[PDB]
Design a protein around this ligand. Structure first.
Ligand SMILES: CC(C)=CCC/C(C)=C/CC/C(C)=C/CS
Ligand SMILES: CC(C)=CCC/C(C)=C/CC/C(C)=C/CS
Lengths: 496, 492
């Protein structure tokens, strides 16, 4: 070893710095008292129980864990909950380490957080403390279904972060964890009170190739993305519709590994005004208007692939800025006889605004305001006018927030937090895929939803059909297996 | 050709398709777009998911609706039509009858989805000749693969020397051959005749959990709350029913623990009350559920005789309401009735040789209609979960064969359709035990059970029974772990 006790720079001798949260960045106290006299008085007796491991791996929540520990610890459940509340109220941030962490960030970053913490705890620590900004990737046990003593969680961080094991020193107060990091070749660093001792799957690939083959055959046979319509989100008993260009636009905009021949082909079916209608020209009702959602998404894609320029787009952008309701909010159609608003349509319009350099036009203030309130107020939990699913709002919101960093910083932590609480709260592959992508683009690895996504791939490579959007006048859903597969493969792509 | 060869084998394994059953696949509806051949569905990769129980028919038909560019209602009508063409191979079922009567060991092993299998199970009456039924949708395993064969040979402990498979597919019998099993193929003309330890860890970890728990607390602990998960339950360990259930249902209990829990019980009326005596509300009565279960257990362990039991059995026969059904309490000021309690009284009654007392008729009748009417899905007065009634019924039906045969096939049928229908481990374990007792292996519920064991070895708390007035759930981690372990023990 080499006991350290003075301003050291042995750190700068390494490329990757991995932190644990406990003692190193956060300290708490475990003895607490309530009006109830029965049972344990030290929360560490819970934290050391084996049931606490289930809670750390995401396999149970705190309500479950506390009901079991009532039995095992012979303590009223309300007492354990209250001692747990008191324990986390004693949380104090180590301010030396936090300054040393802000420093490491300021330099050549490359800092990862790898802690054992249960999901609801990590949610609270995320929103209550402001040191996550210095982390390049957050690897939390509840998001991984992995617990720190086991070697497999160590193996996972080395693969996922793709870090040279020889250029790595990992900081902890537990010695068991230091030994296992040492096994893979990572230099270690104990954090005693006054001392700082120094020292120095293919199954995935099969399923990914399978699913890419499914999606390619489907979009080569139908470059115009098919769509089924039904009255439920699983589209059970859906009938073929296939007369709207929006599914094609959404696929082009979102899956990033599409072959060149498929991009050209679908991009051809779309160029068929510089404004676009929901419907295939063939299927469009007479005097049915163009909408800002199909237009925004397509223009953003054409601008992004350089098939079009800002000057080409500016006239349509002004038409959108002149499409505002009485409250100043940009509306869904170019049809003053059909005023509608929708938060996800607003996100997409604002997205193109920022793409073309119109991001600070005064006429956008009320439209961005509506999107922010729709998030903070938790209205998004009831869906938007055309998108029932709450993660779809969080998904499109995360694109605008991450892609224009300095123009949306007030959305960042609220949106990351909303996403963290929603980890693994639904079974639909498309919603899981959305959460994996968004969190990863926000710096948080969501391996739970990833694994359960792998499990729901049908044997032909594709994922089940999903009703991503809805016509509200009849609550008729639209979807395809193509859309589901397209986001699942994107989520597999962004995590491996 | 006469098959004297068959008698040269101790165990015979039947496939279902073409061997026992025939169907035609070309069909027409008022809809003309799409396929005309249902075999274009069964040969699609998505069908394999359906066969392994990973998706249901609705899912599969919506996916194939899109893949086969065929309207989904057409695919459903076509599939309904294909099933109505089903024909039993009448020669084959007569062999089967013979082989069953020759006291041979006969197994069924076929790829079939769960909704089709429940229909076949009701629609045809040749399942009685089977000793175990192995079905892909219950196994989460498909027939061509090596690990469904390996699973059959372990589960049934098959002497691959003395055992002969019978199929109509060369891929199938080739795999059967590789395990040492003689293969005999079929056709309309020719009949060709050639020749995890993870589980152990979990069972060991859970046995220790339950053992320490019942050595600390022989009177099985009990928790009261208002929901089935007993979330935020308060300890109430003042009832003895839980001890009686555990004593009566877990078969690998260590002898010291039976001893202790039995001494807990006896503490001389030969009748029992829900409450520990230090908690019995003044003038609260004995009940036939606790009394029936304990007596049934004491007799089965030879701590008692039929002769000691008859007086209280006759007191039960004298406890019938005006409709003639035997009632819950030994008290005429609390007339209640409950299906499961009647099940448990009828169980003891048959145990002591009273099974055909004419006074039991109205109570057996009541139990039957509670099943056939699907009223059990609404729960009983004291037991909310529908699988609890099916579980106690299957004990009664199976342990007294030829006394309850009208129950056998309806009850198995319900159980089949409830496979993987709830998440609660205790409910999973009841379905596994009950179906296994009825000849059917439920590996689907069993694998999900193994996922929900907690790290200290126990399963989570479950509210098994209920106080209807206040709507209070009672239960424990001890009750869950006991039935989970029983289920692991029976499917192993
Ligand atoms: C989901 C969405 C807003 C896509 C952009 C085009 C749009 C507003 C269509 C109206 C919603 C709808 C399906 C109408 C079917 S008549
Ligand atoms: C032991 C058991 C479940 C019997 C089912 C019939 C019975 C006597 C119920 C009384 C149990 C109870 C919930 C009493 C609340 S005061």
């Amino acid at each position: 070893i080499t006991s350290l006790q003075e301003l050291s720079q042995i750190l700068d001798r390494y490329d990757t710095i991995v932190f644990d949260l406990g003692d190193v960045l956060l300290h708490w106290d475990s003895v607490h008292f309530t009006s109830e006299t029965k049972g344990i008085d030290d929360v560490r007796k819970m934290v050391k129980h084996p049931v606490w491991q289930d809670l750390e791996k995401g396999l149970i929540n705190q309500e479950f864990a506390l009901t079991a520990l009532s039995c095992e610890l012979e303590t009223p459940c309300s007492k354990l909950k209250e001692m747990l509340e008191l324990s986390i109220a004693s949380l104090q941030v180590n301010p030396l380490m936090v300054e040393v962490l802000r420093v490491l960030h300021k330099k050549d970053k490359q800092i990862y957080c790898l802690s054992n913490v249960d999901l609801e705890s990590f949610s609270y620590l995320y929103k209550q403390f402001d040191f996550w900004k210095y982390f390049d990737g957050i690897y939390v046990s509840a998001l991984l279904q992995l617990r720190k003593p086991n070697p497999d969680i160590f193996q996972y961080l080395i693969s996922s972060a793709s870090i040279n094991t020889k250029s790595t020193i990992f900081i902890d107060d537990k010695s068991e964890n230091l030994q296992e990091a040492a096994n893979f070749g990572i230099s270690t660093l104990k954090y005693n009170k006054d001392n700082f001792e120094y020292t120095a799957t293919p199954e995935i690939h099969k399923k990914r190739t399978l699913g890419e083959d499914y999606l390619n055959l489907r979009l080569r046979k139908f470059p115009f993305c098919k769509s089924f319509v039904s009255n439920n989100v699983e589209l059970i008993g859906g009938e073929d519709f296939s007369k709207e260009i929006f599914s094609t636009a959404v696929i082009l905009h979102s899956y990033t590994s599409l072959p060149d021949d498929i991009i050209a082909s679908m991009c051809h079916e779309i160029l068929n005004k510089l404004r676009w209608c929901f419907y295939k020209n063939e299927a469009r009702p007479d005097n049915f208007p163009d909408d800002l959602d199909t237009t925004s998404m397509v223009l953003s894609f054409l601008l992004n692939h350089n098939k079009l320029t800002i000057e080409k787009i500016i006239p349509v952008a002004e038409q959108m800025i002149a499409n505002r309701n009485e409250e100043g909010i940009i509306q869904v159609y170019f049809d003053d006889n059909r005023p509608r608003i929708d938060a996800i349509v607003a996100i997409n319009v604002l997205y193109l605004m920022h793409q073309i350099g119109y991001g600070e036009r005064k006429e956008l203030k009320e439209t961005e305001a509506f999107v922010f309130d729709f998030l903070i107020s938790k209205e998004y939990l009831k869906g938007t006018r055309y998108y029932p699913a709450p993660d779809v709002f969080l998904f499109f919101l995360s694109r605008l927030v991450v892609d224009f960093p300095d123009q949306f910083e007030k959305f960042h932590k609220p949106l990351t937090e909303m996403l963290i609480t929603r980890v693994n709260c639904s079974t639909f592959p498309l919603e899981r895929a959305l959460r994996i992508i968004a969190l990863k683009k926000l710096g948080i690895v969501n391996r739970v939803d990833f694994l359960k996504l792998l499990d729901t791939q049908l044997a032909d490579g594709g994922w089940p059909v999903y009703g991503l959007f809805i016509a509200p006048r009849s609550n008729t859903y639209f979807g395809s297996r193509e859309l589901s597969t397209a986001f699942a493969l994107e989520a597999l792509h962004i995590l491996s």
